[PDB]
Design an enzyme around this catalytic site. Structure first.
Site, PDB file in Angstrom:
ATOM      1  N   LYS A  69       9.426  -8.079 -18.756  1.00  0.00           N
ATOM      2  CA  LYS A  69       8.292  -8.811 -18.228  1.00  0.00           C
ATOM      3  C   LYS A  69       7.018  -8.027 -18.431  1.00  0.00           C
ATOM      4  N   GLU A 121       4.050  -3.911  -3.232  1.00  0.00           N
ATOM      5  CA  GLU A 121       4.891  -3.217  -4.204  1.00  0.00           C
ATOM      6  C   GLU A 121       5.376  -1.886  -3.644  1.00  0.00           C
ATOM      7  N   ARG A 122       6.067  -1.132  -4.495  1.00  0.00           N
ATOM      8  CA  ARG A 122       6.463   0.227  -4.159  1.00  0.00           C
ATOM      9  C   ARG A 122       5.386   1.192  -4.635  1.00  0.00           C
TER      10      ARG A 122
END
Ligand SMILES: Nc1ncnc2c1ncn2[C@@H]1O[C@H](COP(=O)(O)OP(=O)(O)OP(=O)(O)O)[C@@H](O)[C@H]1O
Lengths: 466, 160, 508, 466, 73
Positions: free
Chosen positions: D162, D188-189
């Site tokens: 992706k 997100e992380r």
């Protein structure tokens, strides 16, 4: 009593319920616990404040019922809740659930009006320690180890001689153990409770434990009350150094009891409306029961089965409140042996492999191997003709006949009941005499020789009798 | 109409008021206040008012402010509270304050009304009927009384 | 409410005009169980923790206008209200920095050390959050499970996060402390926060604190049945801060905590008591708002961190903070909202079967159903490289066993696999209190890799000549220290192991 | 941003919560949206009025927390909410979720303090029309058709490239498509977001889209904020005619986000307390995204799976927000082909039978027949020895090897990643070259020849390479 | 709340049409595009309004009903 000299309070504002919608001497509020003792019509009323809420208007509740009175009132405030005559004098003498002289005046020895609130010790106080336990039950205290000053989950159905073995506990906890042996119960059958007075004569040893009973129609507070005053008692026994070991009736009564409790609150209760902190009350509970400094604070752990719940946050808590797992065999009762119950599922947790190390990792763990030995020797070797089975499997069937017969042994209970004397047993004569004998030694020892016969001198010297 | 908020009122009325003796004095002031809300324009205008300050303002102001300062700054108290919405609660509870303080009374049965203040039962009572004089009971005189004993009687006519 | 006064409405007669009581102390208005409507303390500071009369700084969070409701500081129920306020605007000051390590704590702190005189740097707030996204270190920083199957199955490093469930009565409570034995030497100071613990567990536990060692490595949390949501519920929220001692030294900070849900209805049942909305399961997203808050924290942080994290004191140390979840395996109730939520949150994950603890197989857990984010990412040439083919092959001996019964006659495919995988499968189990050596891992590396165990492969000789292997190995393999030192897959040393493996046949 | 010159307001009446129990300059009330920017202690406080309610007393809320302040206050009223520097200058430059210079000052190009409120067009405005889309992905834009200026439901698990294909989107939406290619994310992380900055270097093309991120610990308003300002951005790109196409992160974050929203309201929320109008917010949403007059207002539709809900009022809405259905194959990733994902479940809705008519009703619909062809040729013919299967089923297995290999094709992504160049592909060379070839033509084209090889000149001229 | 509800503060002088449901009626208006919220729409908002009507409709007389088999193609 405390104060409550002065009648205090005032009206019961909205007269609904045992909890107080009530005018107290409005400035007057005690500790919510700190009791308020009125006159209830004729009766002297009392409520420990259910709520601490001002204006002398706070919930203050009781196990009774209010119909008939005026909203108007005045209610003396018993400055103490919890303080009720308590100590070891009660032993044998019948306390109401009130501790009141339950019997013709059961006169459980009036003692310190003593706060129920006795509770957990310091890390060291009741034993920073571990204290093991056995009373030498004939085939049993040998079978499982135990930890002193505590409680262990009891699973077994029927035909226990629980009263018999209780006489063995009289013969132990009273006799073969000194530590003050107390017990209490609640929620029984009326003349069958009176028949536990009959049994109280059967053991006759009833004198070790005051008679205090619930009779389950007792309201939810009534039903749930007696314990902490029980700690005003072990506040003798364990505190009296004569280790408090008191037998514990009813969890379902207690589990469901706390349910009805938090329900009555209308509060967000525990799940399914149970007492939210009932478990925390177990932290206070085992917090009470420890082989103590004072004296081992010990309790017989058997549960009114909270419906014998599945995964049972009770058994979940009663697991780890079981140092030893438990089962009772109608099959060993079908074996009918003086060992009439289920050794299967009954042993101390850490006994065999370590913590006795080999001592039970050999005698008892290897003994469990023998449980496989008559397990598939009796069982497997039973499946078809055991001729295939080495006679060891038939000397695991003399583990059954011979050895398991040796398990059948007279009982200090059976002394106190049938006269079959029994003993505080020596598992040496198991760890050796029954381990070596039951395994390889004197395998010629008859079942009968061993049957109903105590340690390997009774079973194997009954093998001198054969 | 809760009158319980107004209970704390009439409380503070005998209390601060009678303490100030405004129980009478702001029985007067209070009287003028119930006169104020009694004004129906002052009812018609009673509450549109967001600022309760505006209310005590146009209230003491409008009416003429016969309230005490205990009732003017208290006018801040209840007006601000907006519990001032209900005038008569602690008015009859103050009537109950001084009056309950003074309570002696009577009630006419089988009679036109009595209400002769009797500190004790039969005290001014038997003194009144004995004192009757009146003795007529006119309202409840006969049909009421004779239908009282005869009421019990028809109650026996329950036999039919 | 307001009318209650009637005495201060007696005042308010004037004292609605008359005025001006603003003080840090106005009365506790309403006393029930540490919840008191309360007065004065006009503007008071953040949840301002108000040193209570004979009692802790009492906190009231969002200002309740009329009478601020207040929090039980220790004892909830003692007395009637009207305390004025024994008052402090300060909330959140607790001994900070690296000072007090190793000497045990209360929920209060080091004081519950028998010493109790363990001095951290000094009072600090208890909160913490994520290391710099940017300013973050990725620490492969491998880790040794002490039960090898995990370690090789899952290496990891500073910064990590993963999920765990310990099974009923086994193996949750006991869990891995052999690893802690292995981690007695861990050297990244590690502590565990256990919610609402039972004491003697902590006592004989301390016997294992001597035994396994070493309590001095770090002091640890204290919570028991009496833990308030302060103690209980806030404990996980509480422990967030001072690990920055290490972490924001840029130094490695790591700690443990597990099974807090007494936080969930401590705080949530509090919300009921708070009359505050119980979320799903009567507790709100303050799960994920707490994990949001607290659980977003653990990272190895950049040099850019300790250039800031240590403020350029460590001038770019990589603030290393690793931590991991254990939600002890219980009830089979799983997604469990927050747990699902936190499942979503969980970077790594342990599905852990009791069944083999139920089977008593020292190896209880669900095999790769436990899924860690990190894994062999931290594993070395021997570990990553040499140790590779595990779990799928596992699935084999499993799946290879699978058909055997109903449709039978599995060839030496499954026999020579499922059993080979049943034999090795047997070699897996690592008992409680078993740490695992890296050289000891090399045993599988060569052996399995060499297939070398197939010689002794009889679990009798597998274990046996596995022991002769161990022994005369240790004899024949002194240089293994290097190897143990080494990350392995050293072709030279590899052949060396083939030879000492031929030794390992009879001897080692 | 606006007035709020003058500090306005007044106290925060009952200090509870980010929503305002607050005295404003009581006559002062703005539009509830129309912001109120105070000083928050040190910080400048701000709340868009959560409630419009009089007396300057209305809910006015923020993503932060209130402890510590006085109920007293004054709060300047930012006459505008929504107006924040916005435009296409941000592209590549890191915006906070505030748009703030997220990075070392990420300095997403400061632009019109621009109302977030950009929204739906007239029937004709964003063109009353239909606008199809493809960027010529090697095996893919050929595989599925698309409609320009929009979003389509994305279902696929892992190993997408992706980011790779995003580089193909750089190689497309930036390159093989001009229209301004923007994107944003949230939740997100941390260092893995920083690792998406690493990836931001992998594509390196990050300059097309400002960096604006949520980091899910962001509070519910914080979490749910960024979009409409995103419309102050497409208020450049699409509005800038350089068609706004912006990649869309997180539905579960958004679905659950609106849940937490209407929850916080305490209002009768949507079912299960969700945002009642969150769907209406989807009407505003697709209402924003249209191949426009201005420039195609387009969005990459991929959902934080609202638990990947079943029947998923989200997927229910995301169906019909999917012009093309989607799947990604770990199996074609197990096939590992340069076509590594699931063509199964991935195609435009109306492409084959009509709307390409035969063009895809032949090439693509007949191609789907070929999906049956290697489907039961590969599958069925795989069941047992395919000797039965006509070699067509094995030339459906050269549809697999040969043709499906041709599907494996270099990628404009793989150029931007592995160097494998890839292209904006020509489905003619599919509709013919791969349709005729894959079907009947040059069936001798090797898998490898076709494998990892682009359109039938790369696959089939790689069949000149064979 | 008809249409946008968020604009301004309460206390806007309450303006009152005493008519619920006066809406263009009658057969004049066919074909010209209309919003549901209003007869206007692109392109021609306009249509031939036989006049303001109220919508709601009860069933016609059962008794007085033309039973109609009027066919379906
Ligand atoms: N797979 C296993 N096989 C055999 N024994 C095990 C296994 N796992 C754990 N055990 C034993 O059980 C103990 C672990 O039990 P522990 O004290 O963790 O209870 P628990 O697992 O916490 O249960 P719960 O989850 O209900 O709290 C250890 O002493 C260990 O020896």
């Amino acid at each position: 009593h405390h104060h409550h000299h002065g009648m205090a309070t005032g009206k019961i504002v909205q007269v609904i319920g045992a909890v107080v919608d009530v005018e107290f001497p409005q400035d007057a509020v005690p500790r919510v616990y700190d009791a308020l003792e009125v006159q209830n019509g004729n009766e002297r009323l009392v409520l420990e404040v259910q709520q601490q809420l001002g204006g002398g208007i706070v919930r203050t509740i009781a196990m009774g019922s209010s119909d008939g009175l005026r909203r108007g009132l005045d209610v003396k405030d018993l400055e103490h809740p919890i303080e009720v005559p308590v100590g070891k004098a009660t032993l044998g003498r019948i306390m109401n659930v009130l501790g009141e002289p339950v019997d013709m005046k059961g006169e459980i020895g009036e003692e310190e009006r003593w706060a129920i609130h006795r509770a957990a010790p310091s890390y060291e106080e009741l034993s920073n320690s571990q204290e093991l336990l056995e009373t030498g039950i004939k085939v049993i205290d040998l079978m499982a180890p135990f930890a002193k000053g505590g409680k262990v989950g009891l699973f077994g159905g029927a035909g226990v001689g629980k009263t018999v073995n209780m006489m063995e506990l009289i013969r132990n906890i009273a006799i073969e153990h000194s530590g003050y042996s107390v017990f209490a119960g609640v929620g029984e059958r009326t003349r069958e409770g009176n028949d536990f007075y009959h049994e109280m004569t059967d053991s006759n040893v009833i004198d070790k434990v005051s008679l205090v009973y619930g009779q389950m129609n007792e309201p939810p507070g009534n039903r749930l009350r007696v314990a902490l005053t029980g700690l005003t008692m072990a506040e003798k026994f364990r505190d009296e150094g004569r280790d408090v070991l008191l037998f514990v009736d009813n969890i379902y009564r207690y589990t469901l009891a706390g349910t009805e409790v938090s329900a009555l609150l209308g509060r967000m209760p525990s799940a399914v409306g149970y007492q939210p902190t009932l478990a925390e009350e177990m932290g206070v509970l085992q917090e009470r029961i420890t082989s103590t400094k004072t004296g081992s604070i010990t309790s017989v752990q058997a549960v009114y089965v909270p419906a014998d719940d599945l995964t049972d946050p009770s058994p979940a808590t009663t697991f780890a409140h079981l140092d030893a797992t438990v089962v009772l065999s109608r099959q060993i009762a079908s074996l009918g042996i003086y060992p009439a119950v289920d050794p299967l599922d009954s042993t101390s947790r850490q006994l065999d492999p370590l913590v006795v190390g080999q001592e039970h990792y050999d005698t008892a763990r290897g003994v469990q191997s023998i449980l496989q030995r008559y397990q598939e020797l009796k069982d497997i070797i039973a499946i078809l003709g055991m001729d295939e089975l080495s006679e060891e499997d038939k000397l695991v069937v003399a583990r059954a006949r011979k050895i398991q017969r040796f398990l059948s042994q007279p009982f200090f209970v059976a002394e106190v009941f049938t006269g079959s004397p029994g003993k505080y047993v020596s598992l040496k004569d198991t760890i050796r005499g029954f381990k070596g004998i039951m395994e390889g030694e004197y395998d010629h020892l008859p079942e009968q020789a061993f049957y109903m016969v105590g340690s390997i001198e009774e079973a194997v010297e009954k093998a001198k009798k054969l | 109409e809760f009158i319980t908020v107004a209970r704390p009122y009439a409380k503070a009325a005998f209390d601060f008021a009678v303490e100030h003796q405004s129980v009478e004095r702001w029985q007067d002031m209070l009287a003028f206040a119930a006169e104020v809300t009694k004004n129906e324009q002052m009812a018609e205008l009673l509450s549109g008012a967001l600022a309760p300050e505006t209310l005590a303002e146009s209230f003491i102001a409008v009416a003429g402010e016969q309230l005490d300062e205990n009732g003017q700054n208290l006018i801040r108290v209840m007006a601000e509270n907006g519990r001032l919405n209900a005038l008569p609660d602690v008015l009859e509870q103050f009537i109950h304050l001084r009056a309950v303080s003074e309570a002696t009374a009577e009630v006419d049965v089988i009679s036109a009304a009595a209400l002769s203040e009797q500190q004790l039962a039969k005290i001014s009572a038997a003194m009144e009927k004995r004192l009757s004089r009146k003795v007529k009971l006119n309202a409840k005189i006969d049909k009421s009384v004779m239908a009282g004993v005869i009421i019990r009687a028809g109650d026996m006519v329950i036999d039919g | 409410n307001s009318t209650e006064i009637s005495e201060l409405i007696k005042q308010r007669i004037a004292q609605f005009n008359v005025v001006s009581e603003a003080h840090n102390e106005g009365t506790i208005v309403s006393v029930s169980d540490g919840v008191i409507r309360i007065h004065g303390l006009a503007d008071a500071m953040q949840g301002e923790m108000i040193s209570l009369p004979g009692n802790r700084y009492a906190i009231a969070l969002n200002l309740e206008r009329d009478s601020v409701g207040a929090v039980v500081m220790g004892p909830y129920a003692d007395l009637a209200e009207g305390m004025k306020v024994k008052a402090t605007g300060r909330i959140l000051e607790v001994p900070v920095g690296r000072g007090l390590l190793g000497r045990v704590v209360n929920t209060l702190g080091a004081p519950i050390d028998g010493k109790g005189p363990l001095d951290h740097d000094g009072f600090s707030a208890v909160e913490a959050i994520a290391p710099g996204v940017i300013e973050r270190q990725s620490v492969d920083q491998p880790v040794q499970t002490g039960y090898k199957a995990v370690d090789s199955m899952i290496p990891i490093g500073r910064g990590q996060r993963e999920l765990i469930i310990g099974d009923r009565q086994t193996g949750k409570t006991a869990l891995a402390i052999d690893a802690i034995i292995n981690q007695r030497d861990s050297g990244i100071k590690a502590i565990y926060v256990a919610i609402g613990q039972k004491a003697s567990t902590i006592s004989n536990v301390v016997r294992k604190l001597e035994e396994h060692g070493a309590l001095a490595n770090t002091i640890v949390v204290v919570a028991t049945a009496s833990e308030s949501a302060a103690l209980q519920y806030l404990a996980p929220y509480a422990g967030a801060a001072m690990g920055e001692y290490f972490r924001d030294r840029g130094e490695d900070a790591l700690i443990i905590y597990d099974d807090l849900s007494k936080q969930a209805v401590a705080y949530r049942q509090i919300s009921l008591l708070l009359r505050r909305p119980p979320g799903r399961e009567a507790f709100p997203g303050d799960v994920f708002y707490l994990h949001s808050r607290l659980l977003e924290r653990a990272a190895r942080v950049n040099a850019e961190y300790v250039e800031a994290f240590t403020k350029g004191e460590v001038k770019g140390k990589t603030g290393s903070l690793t931590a991991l979840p254990i939600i002890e395996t219980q009830a089979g109730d799983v997604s469990a909202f927050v747990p699902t939520n936190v499942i979503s949150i969980t970077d790594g994950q342990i599905f852990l079967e009791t069944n083999l603890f139920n089977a008593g197989i020292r190896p209880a857990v669900n095999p790769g159903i436990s899924v860690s984010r990190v894994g062999g990412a931290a594993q070395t040439k021997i570990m990553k490289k040499l140790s590779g083919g595990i779990r799928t092959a596992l699935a084999q001996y499993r799946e290879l066993a699978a058909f055997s019964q109903f449709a039978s006659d599995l060839d030496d495919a499954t026999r020579n696999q499922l059993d080979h995988g049943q034999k090795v499968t047997e070699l897996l189990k690592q008992k409680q209190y078993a740490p695992m050596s890296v050289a000891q891992q090399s045993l599988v590396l060569f052996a399995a890799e060499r297939g070398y165990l197939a010689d002794v492969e009889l679990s009798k000789i597998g274990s046996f000549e596995a022991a002769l292997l161990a022994y005369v190995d240790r004899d024949h393999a002194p240089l293994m220290q290097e190897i143990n030192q080494t990350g392995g897959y050293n072709d030279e040393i590899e052949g060396k192991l083939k030879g000492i493996l031929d030794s390992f046949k009879a001897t080692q």
